[PDB]
Structure formats: C-alpha cells, structure tokens
Write a protein that binds this DNA or RNA. Structure first.
Ligand SMILES: Cc1cn([C@H]2C[C@H](O)[C@@H](COP(=O)(O)OP(=O)(O)OP(=O)(O)O)O2)c(=O)[nH]c1=O
Ligand SMILES: Cc1cn([C@H]2C[C@H](O)[C@@H](COP(=O)(O)OP(=O)(O)OP(=O)(O)O)O2)c(=O)[nH]c1=O
Ligand SMILES: [Mg+2]
Ligand SMILES: [Mg+2]
Ligand SMILES: [Mg+2]
Lengths: 694, 105, 4
DNA sequence: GGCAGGTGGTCTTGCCGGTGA
DNA sequence: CCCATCACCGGCAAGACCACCTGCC
C-alpha cells in the first residue's frame, strides 16, 4: 500500500501539465517527491505498486488524480496509463461513507473553536486535516502572500499555473494528511475489522475483509466518475430555440401585466427607525428612515448656498419607483391585496404565502385583475424553465462542453440515506415529460445527439427504471409481519395503477406521490393537498390504505423499539434518547436516522439506494463480461443515473436491447444477493432521447 | 390654504403659476411627510403673498412624480417660472424651511 | 428478530 | 491631506418557492 | 410542520463590504 497525491495546472476538464507528485510507501515508511521531469518515474512507481498486487490511496483520486494522470500521461508522455479500479482507494469516498454525518458532528468542532467555518461539513483535504490536526497552512495562502509582496494581483487559481518548491512542499503535506485520514478511517471497527492491518494487506484482502459498503462505495464512485467524463449528449440548438420562444412569451406576459399593473412608489433603503419627533419614541409602524448627519441651507465661511438635497437632522423616507415584477412575491401580494384578496395563510417571518396553491385559488372582483393572476402563473413557470435552461448560473446552456455534452456532477453518497446528489447542473431535477415544456427539455438530452466517431450515425438510448422500488423494500421489511402477503400482492398488476384506482386519483403520478406521502407519515391535511381535497379525505385515504396492510403499523412500531428509548418535546424540538441512532444498511453500513418520524423513510430510502447502487454496478459489470466496452469509442456509455433509473447510450439498437435485458438480470441478481423477500423488477425503453425513454 | 395638485392640474398650477411655488411631494405612509405637514400649514400662511404652497401625493398622481425623479420623501421643490429653482429633501424644521425659502426667494 |  | 459622511457598485445570506426521485 | 422523506437551484430583497465622491477642518 502507498499513499499519493498529485498537483496539476488545471481541473480535469482543462489540465495540460503535470506539476508534481508524492508517494508514501508503507513498506519503506518513506516519502518520495516527483518534480515535473519525474512524471514518467512517478507513473512507474504507481504501476509498480499495481504489479505487486498492492493498493494506491488518493483523496478524490477516483474523480481527479486517476483520470488526470491518464489524460496527462497520454498528452505529455504518449503512454496509456490506467490504474485498475480494484487497486485504488479513495479517502473521500471512505470519508463520505463512514462520516456521512458531518453537518451535525461538526458543530462542536466549531463551537469549541477548531475548524475554520468555511470548512463546515466539508470532506475536503483541508477540512479533514484541520479536524485531524495536521494543518500547517494552505498553499494558496502562501502564494497569495508572495504575490502581495511583489505587488501583483491574484487571479482565481493562478497558484497552479506553474510549479515551484512551495507547491511541492504543500504536496507532501497533502500526502501526510491523506495518510492521517486513511488511518483514522481504518480505525473504525464497524467498517474495518481490528484483527487486520488494512495498511499491510493486498487489494483482494482489503475488499474481502472490509465491510461490503466500502467495496460498493468505491465501485459506485469509479463508475459514476466514468459517467461524468462521458457526459449526456445535449441538443444545444433545440434549447436555444426554446429559449427564444420562452423569452418572447415572457416579454408578452410582462407587457400585458405592466399594462394592467402600473408603477408605484415604495420604500427602499431605510435602515434607521422613524421615531416620534417630540418624544423621541420609535414608531415601527412607519417604514425605515434615513436622517442625514450633514447638510444645511448654506455652506461654511453672502455665504454661498448648499445645493445638496438634504439637511442635517431632517429625516426622510428613501423610496423607489417600481414597475410591476411578476417574479417578486411582494409585488404580487401587494397588488392582489389592493384588488381585494384577503390572505389566509402566512409565513413564520411575517409575509403572506404567494405560491401556486394560493394563486390558483385567489379570487378578486375586477375581471382584469383575476385574469392577470393567470398571466402571473404562466410567467412564473416560464421563468422557471428559462432560469433552469438558459439564464441561471448553472443553466444547461452554460454547461455544454466542446463535445456537445453536459457533464453533470454526482456525489455518490451525498444523501444521509445513501442516495447520491446531483449538481452543476442537477440532472435529477429536469422537468418531467408530463410537465409544461418537459418533453422538449427531456428530448434535448439524448444519445441521438451524439454521432458515432466511425460511422457518424446517431447513437440509440436505453432507459431502465426500477419498478416500485421503495414499495418493494417495504414489502421486504414487513414480510416478517405479514408472512410475505404484501410482497406477493404487489406484483398483481402495477401497484401504482392499482392504488390510483383504489384511491380514485386522476393520474398514476398522483398515486405515486400519494402512496409515498402516506407511507412516510403525511398528515391528514397533507394527504388532502396531495390528492386535491381536505383533511376529511386525508383521514379516509389514510385509514383505507392503513387498514388494508396493517403490517405497516407493526413495522413502524418495531423501528421505534429498535431506535428510540424515550422522548420529550421542549419548544419546537424533540429531545430523543437513542438506543441506537442508526439503521443497518443492506450492505452493513450505518445509516444515520435524523428523526424518529422519518425512520421508516430512512429504512426504505436507504435500502432502495443501496439496491440501486449495486444494480448500476452489476449491470455494467455484466455488460463488460459480455464483451461490451464502456465509452463513446466502444459499445455503451452511462449517461445518467437518477436514483433508480439509468440512461445508457448505445452505439446500436442491438446493444441497447442487450443493455435493457442485462439491467433486468442485474436487478434480479441484486435481489438474490441480499436475500430480498420481495421480487425486484425493472422496466426498459429504447429510444432516441430521455423524453421517449420514460 | 394649500393647493392640492393633481396630474391634470399640475401644468396649469405649477409650471405656469406666475408666482413662486413650493411643491411638496408626499405619501400618506411616510413619517417625515407627517412631520413637515404642520410646518407647511404654517409656512403657507406666513408667506401668503410672496409664495404659494402646493402638495402632490405621489400615490394619487403617478404621472407627475416620475418626471421629477423622486428618490426620497418629503421632497420640497421650489419652482420659479416653470423651472425648478431649488430642491430640498427631508422633513425640515420651521427654521430650516424659513431659511431655505428666504435664501431662494 | 431484527433486520436493521 | 485626514476625517466624517455619503454614494454607487459588487458580493453574500436568507427567505420563499419550484423541480425531480 | 401533532410532521411525507431525500436532494438542488432560482430570484428578490436586505445587509455587508469596498472604492471613491463631497465638505469641512
Ligand atoms: C484547481 C486545482 C486543484 N488541484 C488539486 C490540489 C488541491 O489539493 C485540490 C484543490 O481543490 P479545489 O478545487 O481548488 O478546492 P478548493 O477548496 O480550493 O475550492 P472548491 O472545493 O470549491 O473547489 O485540488 C490541482 O492540483 N491543480 C489545480 O489546478
Ligand atoms: C415520485 C416519488 C418517489 N419517491 C421514491 C419512492 C420510489 O420507490 C423511488 C423511485 O420513484 P419512481 O421511480 O418515480 O417510482 P417507483 O419506482 O416507486 O414506481 P415506478 O418506477 O414503477 O413508476 O423514489 C418518493 O419518495 N416520493 C415521491 O414523490
Ligand atoms: Mg489530492
Ligand atoms: Mg422506479
Ligand atoms: Mg427513476
């Protein structure tokens, strides 16, 4: 086993020069530095470790160091360098697994005073080194001070443009901190058996003896890193044209709304308080004020007038002339109340609730103002689509790379339940095909938008989704209570269509949101809102579904007996005594339970997430063992993973058909692997884009 | 005593008024406006002959206020032959207003 | 019995 | 030229809401 | 919230911060 870390001239996306590297070898207990001209030797040392069947430890190596070295090795040395997945270890993956609870377990590190605020709940090397106690100082800070000494101005990340001995030293510090993190993580007896010195074992023993969760997490992080590098073929032109149409409709809605709602004056700027002029008593009914501290009618030493607008001591209310803005919720509330609307529901900060629920229900008198409410609802949705697709900071059009693909980021274990998180941009929040402009948005993401490098023909897409995931996880956990009755009934047709009809709901999506709202403890009023009724129908629906499968109550009761031992409420919060604050995941990991009322969701959402993690891992593994190669220069390419669904690009329709069958086989394999008490299934769709594959 | 202006009457009452006009741009929700109101009620009486006090509510007359760039209230604009001779923003006192007027009158 |  | 105060930008938070699984 | 859960992200509006202006000493 060796511990290493690299430094380069830029992020993976634009890296072109290797600056330095450091390797710590446990067999020699020594550190070795590699400068730019030692790049080849550095690569050799890493391959030497692989040749011995050893392990290489990096912090975020799966996503950065490993691929960066492959890219730079080909660009600078013209060599194919590919460290095998089974020989790589990532302290970031391990840290996100063992310590997923860093937004709460970091409070006393900061309350006491030991971690710099900016690194709060951060898994980064600097953050972790601060917690460990190895921090000697940031490299960026030393570079910044050398530049403030030479008078030169600092630019974002210019500290990495060229190599220097300060970078080399900080690189060595990176490896010492990575070593410290590795040893602190291995000291967790829940994940790594104390009997084995995981720093003195081969890769095969490291994976077989450590908890299954460590292996699943490293395999998931390696596969999702490949998925990120692949990207999602995006139709830039289609979204640019949709942006033009939406902007035109926005301009028209704004024109009609500003015609109906004229401008007005309102206070903006005051930070002082207006107070009674004789008594001096504050009068917080009035808007905030500004009292000048300088000014008069004349200047100082036939005396020349003072033409500034203010007089020292004379208070005045700063105001703005404001044109109606449909994107504001203040303008909407003000104008609608000036039209007769009487707000019912408010926010705990003193502001009436202006969302689609109330807007859809607002009733005024003026027919024109009532129609303007519909123009506002359309404008707000139009704005949501424009912001997500083109104008927002993380807008799709701002993230399209030169390869015509969107390389969205994925944190394999960002959620406490074991689910992943998606950002830059969030490919898991694209508007659904059944929502306004959702089909155009989803159609913009598709394999057809990628033309084969050899034949030049567009690729085909294969979308696979887990059938009723969390409900099947519920059937599994409550099978000991109902003897597998629900696990058998669940496969009698589609569960969601059966629930839709049983509950008398308009759509199958409404049945999904209802069953999951109910299962996870929604109140009567909430179930009514979900179904578009009141608390009466909420109770009816709750007792109808809870009476049909009473084992749900037993499961909830058993969860409480396992996690909670007593409780008491003070103020707005629950004071819980925990027998154990976690759930054992399907792979043995500890799954932090945030609150007793979400414990069932923690149990079910974690199981599905772990099921899905092994599914995507097994699917690709099965494809690879079938001769299929992963990449755009191969046979298939993972394009997106949205919780329980995958979108894979396939060079041909035949390959897509194989991907769909393999995903079904991998799901059945996962079910057999963890001895599930409920049969797991998937549903596949072949098509040109995401709009057709779901 | 005071001339309460309107959008349709502003032109014929302020920009063409022969005399010296002190226009007060105010709003019912402003504190300082309520402070300077009694001061105006007395300055209008004291200067009855050499000046005329007019008031324009920026809420009821939205076409006139924008034309003068109101960025704070109460806004005291001293019009002299259709031209703004002097502007002073804030709830001045009886003495500060007397001064401001005498210096510009 | 316990599962989780 | 410094000090106090004012002005106009840019950046950061927090609120409130909408999108997905 | 007598609590659907887990997530990201957008705009508005208010403060914080900062270079740079007047005006007085
Ligand atoms: C950007 C960059 C990072 N690195 C490596 C070395 C550092 O230890 C590490 C810094 O990661 P950063 O991406 O710079 O992380 P940060 O804390 O500065 O800000 P953020 O987390 O939001 O991105 O990445 C390079 O070697 N070269 C580079 O050009
Ligand atoms: C839509 C939705 C899903 N989920 C969870 C439960 C699901 O098991 C998981 C996957 O969601 P979906 O794949 O959208 O729904 P499903 O898998 O349960 O049923 P099907 O695929 O046949 O349409 O996400 C919620 O917790 N709340 C929700 O509102
Ligand atoms: Mg590193
Ligand atoms: Mg599903
Ligand atoms: Mg899905």
């Amino acid at each position: 086993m060796i511990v290493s870390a690299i430094a380069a001239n830029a992020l993976l996306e634009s890296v072109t020069k290797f600056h330095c590297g450091v390797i710590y070898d446990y067999s020699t207990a020594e550190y070795v530095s590699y400068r730019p001209s030692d790049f080849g030797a550095y690569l050799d040392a890493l391959e030497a470790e692989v040749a011995r069947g050893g392990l290489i430890v990096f912090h975020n190596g799966h996503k950065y160091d490993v691929p960066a070295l492959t890219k730079l090795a080909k660009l600078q040395l013209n060599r194919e360098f590919h460290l095998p997945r089974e020989n790589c270890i990532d302290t970031l993956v391990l840290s996100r697994l063992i310590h997923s609870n860093l937004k709460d377990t970091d409070m006393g590190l900061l309350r006491s005073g030991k971690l710099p605020g900016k690194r709060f709940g951060s898994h980064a090397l600097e953050a972790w080194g601060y917690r460990l106690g190895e921090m000697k100082g940031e490299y960026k800070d030393d570079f910044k001070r050398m530049l403030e000494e030479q008078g030169e101005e600092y630019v974002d990340g210019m500290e990495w443009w060229n190599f220097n001995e300060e970078m080399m030293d900080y690189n060595v510090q990176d490896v010492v901190v990575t070593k410290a993190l590795l040893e602190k993580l291995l000291s967790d007896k829940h994940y790594f058996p104390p009997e084995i010195d995981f720093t003195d074992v081969g890769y095969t023993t490291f994976w077989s003896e450590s908890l299954e969760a460590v292996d699943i997490e490293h395999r998931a992080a390696w596969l999702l890193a490949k998925q990120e590098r692949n990207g999602f073929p995006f139709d830039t032109k289609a979204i640019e044209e949709l942006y033009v149409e939406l902007a035109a409709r926005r301009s028209e809605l704004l024109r009609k709304l500003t015609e109906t709602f004229g401008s007005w004056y309102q206070p903006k700027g005051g930070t002082e308080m207006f107070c009674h002029p004789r008594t001096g008593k504050p009068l917080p009914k009035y808007p905030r004020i500004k009292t000048p501290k300088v000014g008069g009618i004349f200047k100082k030493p036939p005396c020349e007038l003072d033409t500034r607008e203010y007089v020292a001591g004379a208070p005045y209310t700063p105001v703005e002339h404001v044109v109606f803005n449909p994107s504001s919720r203040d303008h909407i509330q003000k104008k609608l109340q000036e039209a007769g609307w009487v707000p019912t529901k408010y926010t705990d900060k003193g502001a009436p609730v202006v969302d689609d629920e109330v807007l859809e229900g607002v009733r005024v008198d003026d027919p024109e103002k009532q129609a303007a409410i519909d123009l506002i609802k359309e404008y707000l949705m139009i704005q949501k689509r424009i912001g997500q697709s083109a104008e927002g900071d993380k807008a799709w059009l701002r993230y399209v790379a030169e390869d015509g693909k969107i390389h969205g980021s994925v944190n394999p274990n960002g959620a406490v339940t074991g689910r992943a998180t998606h950002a830059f941009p969030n490919l898991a929040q694209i508007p659904g095909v059944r929502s306004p402009y959702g089909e155009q948005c989803r159609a913009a993401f598709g394999a057809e938008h990628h033309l084969d490098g050899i034949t030049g023909k567009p690729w085909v897409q294969a979308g696979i989704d887990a059938s009723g995931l969390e409900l099947r996880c519920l059937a599994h956990f409550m099978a000991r209570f109902d003897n597998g009755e629900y696990a058998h009934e669940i496969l009698n047709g589609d569960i969601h269509t059966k629930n839709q009809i049983a509950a008398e709901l308009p759509t199958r999506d409404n049945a999904k949101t209802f069953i999951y709202g109910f299962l996870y403890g929604a109140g009567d009023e909430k179930i009514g809102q979900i179904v578009g009724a009141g608390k009466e129908r909420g109770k009816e629906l709750k007792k109808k579904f809870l009476e049909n499968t009473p084992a749900i109550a037993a499961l909830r009761e058993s969860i409480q007996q396992t996690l909670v031992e007593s409780s008491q409420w003070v103020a707005g919060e629950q004071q819980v005594k925990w027998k154990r604050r976690w759930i054992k995941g399907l792979d043995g990991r500890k799954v932090h339970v945030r609150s007793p009322h979400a414990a069932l969701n923690t149990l079910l959402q974690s199981a599905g997430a772990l099921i899905c993690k092994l599914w995507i891992i097994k699917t690709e593994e099965m494809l690879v063992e079938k001769g299929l190669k992963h990449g755009w220069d191969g046979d298939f390419a993972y394009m997106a993973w949205v919780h329980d669904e995958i979108q894979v690009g396939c060079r041909t329709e035949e390959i897509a058909q194989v991907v769909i069958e393999t995903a079904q086989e991998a799901m059945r394999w996962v079910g057999d692997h963890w001895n599930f008490r409920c049969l797991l299934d998937t549903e596949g769709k072949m098509g040109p884009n995401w709009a057709i594959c779901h | 005593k005071i001339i309460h202006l309107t959008d349709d009457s502003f032109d014929t009452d302020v920009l063409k008024a022969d005399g010296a006009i002190l226009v007060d741009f105010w709003a019912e929700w402003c504190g300082p406006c309520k402070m300077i109101a009694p001061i105006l009620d007395e300055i209008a009486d004291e200067y009855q002959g050499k000046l005329t006090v007019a008031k324009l509510n920026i809420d009821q007359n939205p076409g006139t206020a924008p034309k003068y760039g109101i960025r704070g209230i109460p806004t005291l604009l001293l019009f002299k032959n259709g031209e703004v001779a002097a502007t002073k923003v804030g709830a001045l006192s009886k003495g500060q207003l007397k001064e401001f007027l005498d210096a510009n009158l | 019995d316990t599962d989780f």
